[PDB]
Design a protein around this ligand. Structure first.
Ligand SMILES: O=c1c(O)c(-c2cc(O)c(O)c(O)c2)oc2cc(O)cc(O)c12
Ligand SMILES: [Zn+2]
Length: 228
């Protein structure tokens, strides 16, 4: 299941869906694990989120060119943070089209992260406009609302029952909601539940700080956010 490649770990979730794990060394804390997704669409590769650093992000591309040997069409990130947008330069240097939430690109310079080349707009229902998200294929982007951040988005993999909750949704064994610094203590539960309503056929909920859990993770996250 878990393959150690360089300094990252890769785990196959589905025939064309792989999960990558980035690690950050924090002096006095340890190694922070951040999960991501790699989806193969026929002859092209699609990546969700980057690593903690451009270096680690490039290592992912090396793995892609090794096991998949296919070119990456575009990359979509969840929110403007170093835990997901730490390798934006690597994507640009490789000539990969970066797509992110319109707000994420605005918060990027503030947080000190490189803004994406394209911006995604979302309707009142939370669904991304097809115009801003062209040739995405199975990458279905949905914006639940203010949760971990005000720009956090979720990505579902069409054709499968796999949904990426980013750093918003936590596992059913989580004790905390993770980072509550830039988080919202009012719409957190609503946003978490919105994700479950958006992708009801998704049985595999992949997060960025834990392994892919069942739909129980969504309910657990919602229950934890209900106490805010
Ligand atoms: O996603 C993040 C995250 O999980 C943590 C984190 C740090 C800890 O020390 C923990 O104990 C923990 O559970 C999470 O760092 C972060 C710091 C940021 O500036 C932004 C983030 O998005 C994260
Ligand atoms: Zn973040």
């Amino acid at each position: 299941g878990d393959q150690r490649f360089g300094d990252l770990v890769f785990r196959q979730l589905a025939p064309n869906v792989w999960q990558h794990t980035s690690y950050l060394d924090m002096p006095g804390f340890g190694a922070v694990a951040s999960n991501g997704l790699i989806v193969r669409d026929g002859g092209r590769v699609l990546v969700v989120d980057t690593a903690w650093t451009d270096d680690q992000t490039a290592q992912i591309l090396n793995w892609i060119k090794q096991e998949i040997n296919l070119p990456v069409a575009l990359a979509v990130v969840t929110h403007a943070h170093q835990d997901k947008m730490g390798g934006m330069d690597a994507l640009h240097a490789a000539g990969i089209a970066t797509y992110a939430n319109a707000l994420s690109n605005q918060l990027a310079p503030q947080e000190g992260m490189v803004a994406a080349q394209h911006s995604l707009t979302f309707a009142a229902n939370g669904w991304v406009e097809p115009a801003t998200a062209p040739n995405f294929g199975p990458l279905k982007v949905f914006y639940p609302g203010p949760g971990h951040t005000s720009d956090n988005i979720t990505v579902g993999i069409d054709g499968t029952d796999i949904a990426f909750g980013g750093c918003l949704i936590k596992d059913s064994k989580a004790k905390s909601l993770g980072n509550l610094g830039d988080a919202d203590t009012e719409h957190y539960a609503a946003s978490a539940r919105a994700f479950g309503a958006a992708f009801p056929k998704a049985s595999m909920i992949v997060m960025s700080h834990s392994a892919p859990d069942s739909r129980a993770a969504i309910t657990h996250t919602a229950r934890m956010a209900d106490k805010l």
